[PDB]
Amino acid sequence: CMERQLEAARYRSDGALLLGASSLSGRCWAGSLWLFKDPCAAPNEGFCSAGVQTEAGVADLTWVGERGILVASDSGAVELWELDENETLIVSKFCKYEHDDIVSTVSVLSSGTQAVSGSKDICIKVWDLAQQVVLSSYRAHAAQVTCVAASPHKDSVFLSCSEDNRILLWDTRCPKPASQIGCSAPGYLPTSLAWHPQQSEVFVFGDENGTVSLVDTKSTSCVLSSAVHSQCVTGLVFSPHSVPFLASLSEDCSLAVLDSSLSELFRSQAHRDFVRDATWSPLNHSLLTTVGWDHQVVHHVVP
Amino acid sequence: RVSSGRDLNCVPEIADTLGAVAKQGFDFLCMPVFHPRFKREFIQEPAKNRPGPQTRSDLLLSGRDWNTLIVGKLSPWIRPDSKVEKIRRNSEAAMLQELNFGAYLGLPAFLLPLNQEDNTNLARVLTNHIHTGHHSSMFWMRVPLVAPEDLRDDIIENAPTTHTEEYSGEEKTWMWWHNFRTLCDYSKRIAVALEIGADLPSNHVIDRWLGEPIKAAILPTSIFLTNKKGFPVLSKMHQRLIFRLLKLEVQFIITGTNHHSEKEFCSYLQYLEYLSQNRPPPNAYELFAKGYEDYLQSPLQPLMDNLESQTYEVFEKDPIKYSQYQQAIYKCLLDRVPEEEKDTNVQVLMVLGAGRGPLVNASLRAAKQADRRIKLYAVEKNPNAVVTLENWQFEEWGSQVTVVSSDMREWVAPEKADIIVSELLGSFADNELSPECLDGAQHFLKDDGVSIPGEYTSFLAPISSSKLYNEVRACREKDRDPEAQFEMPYVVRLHNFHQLSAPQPCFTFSHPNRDPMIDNNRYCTLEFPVEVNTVLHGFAGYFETVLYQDITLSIRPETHSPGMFSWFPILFPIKQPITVREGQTICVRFWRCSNSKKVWYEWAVTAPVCSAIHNPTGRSYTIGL
Ligand SMILES: Cc1cc(NC(=O)C(=O)N2C[C@@H](C)CC[C@@H]2c2ccc3scnc3c2)cnc1N
Ligand SMILES: CSC[C@H]1O[C@@H](n2cnc3c(N)ncnc32)[C@H](O)[C@@H]1O
Ligand SMILES: [Cl-]
Ligand SMILES: [Cl-]
Numbered sequence A: 001c002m003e004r005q006l007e008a009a010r011y012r013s014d015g016a017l018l019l020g021a022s023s024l025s026g027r028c029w030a031g032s033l034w035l036f037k038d039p040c041a042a043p044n045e046g047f048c049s050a051g052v053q054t055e056a057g058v059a060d061l062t063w064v065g066e067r068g069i070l071v072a073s074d075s076g077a078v079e080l081w082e083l084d085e086n087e088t089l090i091v092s093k094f095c096k097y098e099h100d101d102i103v104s105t106v107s108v109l110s111s112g113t114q115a116v117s118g119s120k121d122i123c124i125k126v127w128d129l130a131q132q133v134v135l136s137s138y139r140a141h142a143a144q145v146t147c148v149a150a151s152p153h154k155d156s157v158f159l160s161c162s163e164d165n166r167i168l169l170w171d172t173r174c175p176k177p178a179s180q181i182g183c184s185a186p187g188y189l190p191t192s193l194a195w196h197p198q199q200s201e202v203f204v205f206g207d208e209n210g211t212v213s214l215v216d217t218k219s220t221s222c223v224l225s226s227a228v229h230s231q232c233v234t235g236l237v238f239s240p241h242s243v244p245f246l247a248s249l250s251e252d253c254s255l256a257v258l259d260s261s262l263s264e265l266f267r268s269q270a271h272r273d274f275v276r277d278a279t280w281s282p283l284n285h286s287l288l289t290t291v292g293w294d295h296q297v298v299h300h301v302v303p
Numbered sequence B: 001r002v003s004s005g006r007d008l009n010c011v012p013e014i015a016d017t018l019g020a021v022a023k024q025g026f027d028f029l030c031m032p033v034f035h036p037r038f039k040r041e042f043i044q045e046p047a048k049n050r051p052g053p054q055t056r057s058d059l060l061l062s063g064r065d066w067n068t069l070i071v072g073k074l075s076p077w078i079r080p081d082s083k084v085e086k087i088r089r090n091s092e093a094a095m096l097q098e099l100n101f102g103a104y105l106g107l108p109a110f111l112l113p114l115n116q117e118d119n120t121n122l123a124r125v126l127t128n129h130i131h132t133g134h135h136s137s138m139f140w141m142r143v144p145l146v147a148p149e150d151l152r153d154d155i156i157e158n159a160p161t162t163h164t165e166e167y168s169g170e171e172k173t174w175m176w177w178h179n180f181r182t183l184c185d186y187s188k189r190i191a192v193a194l195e196i197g198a199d200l201p202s203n204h205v206i207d208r209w210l211g212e213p214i215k216a217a218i219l220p221t222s223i224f225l226t227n228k229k230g231f232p233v234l235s236k237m238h239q240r241l242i243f244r245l246l247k248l249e250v251q252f253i254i255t256g257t258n259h260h261s262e263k264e265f266c267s268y269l270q271y272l273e274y275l276s277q278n279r280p281p282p283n284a285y286e287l288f289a290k291g292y293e294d295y296l297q298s299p300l301q302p303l304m305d306n307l308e309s310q311t312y313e314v315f316e317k318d319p320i321k322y323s324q325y326q327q328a329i330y331k332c333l334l335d336r337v338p339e340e341e342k343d344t345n346v347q348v349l350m351v352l353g354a355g356r357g358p359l360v361n362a363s364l365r366a367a368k369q370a371d372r373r374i375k376l377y378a379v380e381k382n383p384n385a386v387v388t389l390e391n392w393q394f395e396e397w398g399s400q401v402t403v404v405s406s407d408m409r410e411w412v413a414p415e416k417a418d419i420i421v422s423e424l425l426g427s428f429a430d431n432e433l434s435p436e437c438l439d440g441a442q443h444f445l446k447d448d449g450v451s452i453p454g455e456y457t458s459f460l461a462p463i464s465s466s467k468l469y470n471e472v473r474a475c476r477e478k479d480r481d482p483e484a485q486f487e488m489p490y491v492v493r494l495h496n497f498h499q500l501s502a503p504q505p506c507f508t509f510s511h512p513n514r515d516p517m518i519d520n521n522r523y524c525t526l527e528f529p530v531e532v533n534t535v536l537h538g539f540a541g542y543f544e545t546v547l548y549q550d551i552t553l554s555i556r557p558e559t560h561s562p563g564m565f566s567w568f569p570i571l572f573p574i575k576q577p578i579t580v581r582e583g584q585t586i587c588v589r590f591w592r593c594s595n596s597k598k599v600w601y602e603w604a605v606t607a608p609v610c611s612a613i614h615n616p617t618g619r620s621y622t623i624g625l
């Protein structure tokens, strides 16, 4: 058996699909992790590679190399799940209760040995995945942390956004590591963060009003934005393409793929509930897989 | 010991969770009634038509469990005061849904957060829900003692924490609550859940919450330090705050995860128990008074009304009070009768308002202690109490005591009195009309006669209590002025309140009053300097009295007679609360008015703003002659 609300969906380098799921209604509010070597077989339980039950629901997920699965739990724990030698089992490596509320977001840093977590307890923490301990604990924000996104190549740099209407650039080499950015005036609350894969110092942020914005930390100005979605932008993911496409996820229950100038190229009304996560296939870069609370795993073809 | 609760935001299954917190020793559980992350759409399709169920079943627990053990929590995504219209309208519908499900489950309390300045729409929805069927359920507004913005780590390079002092700015969290409860029209169903952080603010910020209806105190696991052994503990300043809240008799909510992994989680709770258990037991006074804490009673009128037998019983159960009266009389007899005249000179001693004769017994003890002769009269107009005196007189006292069943202003005495002993004082000294009574009895006092007491003075202090203001407001009765309850005093053991300035003297009376032109009417203007931001809800009333020379009784907090509980303080409320900010002086005017038939008080605030004159022509309150 599996839970209705699909939260996470991430492709591994070899093209295997990692799903995260939560029960957000009914008797038991638990969670589960699944691996699918056949991505078309998903979300069917009987035709999965490996599966395991978690104590509580998964709010966010991410890979830790090839065999590691880092989980943001409702329990307030950040837990790392080791993959079996033969990839038939998913076993708990550690489960550490360091947050005082739901862990909402996690992001592995460039090195791959350290991670950063954001929680509704307002605190952001930096983890050592080897020692299984919290190196640093930061209370920069004044409200629940919505998204944290590690820089692709810099292990001391990452982004964070919260309901205190702050977008903070972090550099852990500074005694005051956080730096406030955002568009000129206090805009609508930031909900999603994605670093540009190639262009350093360039990221995109979505707000609760459905607007997706392109921002440059060097210029620290609101250079470009577009009213993409009719509701909150919950996820932003860049494609592996040389000139990468930007897939934007929303609670309006629609996928929208955008160019470098945030113009609408493709859109899908396939989902009939909230669209939670999206991941591009490394085998077929044109193929994009989205998951939602309707328990659908839709495989798109982007021109 | 403490009444504790557990706060969780993660409940995999309610049965196993509730069982776990029970073993830990928690009396109730705070939890979501819908999964916190399970955001729901009410307007826009297709999310609108999401298949159910929308949450877990009400069949999972018994009706008793829902009514007693479960406190609901508003889902954190619900933002009725969002700047986005879509999020507003959806959060309105979401809020009503969760509140209505709480009402369906019959929950004793429901938690809603205040973590910003503008909660106007939140208030509008809650007020509408409150006024949709008469229910018992409480609403605990979760308010931080210090705003997270003012508690954050100074780690933002281009947005540093303001190191400059802002007196009013540091109280902003109280203004969030004050504005909210004002918008909801001081609803008795809306209380405070005060959340305490790792770093406590200035005392004035904490004292702001004195008089506020605090039902819960939320303690995160973060704020707890670690001793040498590894057990969780709190700082001396945190311990101070716990002991202040244990007096207010609030419920304690533990929130956050177990950071002290080595030891069991119950350790957090076991520490709170240790604090409360290692406290001086109530013993004398404290327990009797504890039951009466902030209990509004009409002031007794022993002149107009005949007091019940059990009312005299509590008057009589005050050994310190009668020890003083005995000492006052003991001293007086030695002053009036020289040693050589002890057998010749026999003093005429009249107890005016003898009740069941505790002052009569005090007089006899004082006489044989002083080794002086006395002839006792026991004057009492209450003919039911006269039954007690005359049975005393026949069985024990004898001819020595002469019981007189009449009013002391009417009674024609056969001889004049050397000493008159009276007990005719209320909580505001003269509010039982001791002056008018002793004035009427003064003609049968000897030219050089002594009155015990010889002097009494009333005291007033401005107070803040949103709690007591609401209790007065709830005393509205049919078939009278809707605001009559605000224009009369109450005798109350003041508990959850805030003294805004030191008590100053109001009205003084001397006995005997040999003045040719006797006028017991008074007009007094008092200037109360206030050195805090607060809200004026009324004036606490006390009294002091000189029995004889240095022998005194007092219910004035500063000079209060140790272990004396014959009198609780009096409360003079006002119709409208008055804002008083740091530095401003509260100016109150008090009149003692009278005609031939009635005596009453009028009162008015004149600064920093004027109130209405309260109880004009004694329309709401009169003391019968
Ligand atoms: C000796 C003396 C004593 C007092 N003292 C009081 O009135 C007084 O503070 N309390 C409060 C408490 C201690 C219970 C007794 C009494 C009281 C008050 C109000 C009502 S309403 C129905 N019962 C009552 C009881 C007043 N006058 C005199 N002369
Ligand atoms: C011990 S409480 C005061 C007592 O004084 C009595 N008392 C009050 N006024 C008078 C009065 N004018 N004459 C006689 N007894 C009085 C009351 O009935 C009560 O027993
Ligand atoms: Cl419902
Ligand atoms: Cl309760």
Ligand SMILES: [Cl-]
Residues within 6 Å of the ligand: B207, B208, B209, B210, B211, B464, B498, B533, B534, B535
């Ligand atoms: Cl106050």
Ligand SMILES: [Cl-]
Residues within 6 Å of the ligand: B455, B456, B457, B544, B545, B546
């Ligand atoms: Cl006095």
Ligand SMILES: [Cl-]
Residues within 6 Å of the ligand: B506, B507, B508, B509, B522
């Ligand atoms: Cl006076």
Ligand SMILES: [Cl-]
Residues within 6 Å of the ligand: B523, B524, B525
């Ligand atoms: Cl005056």
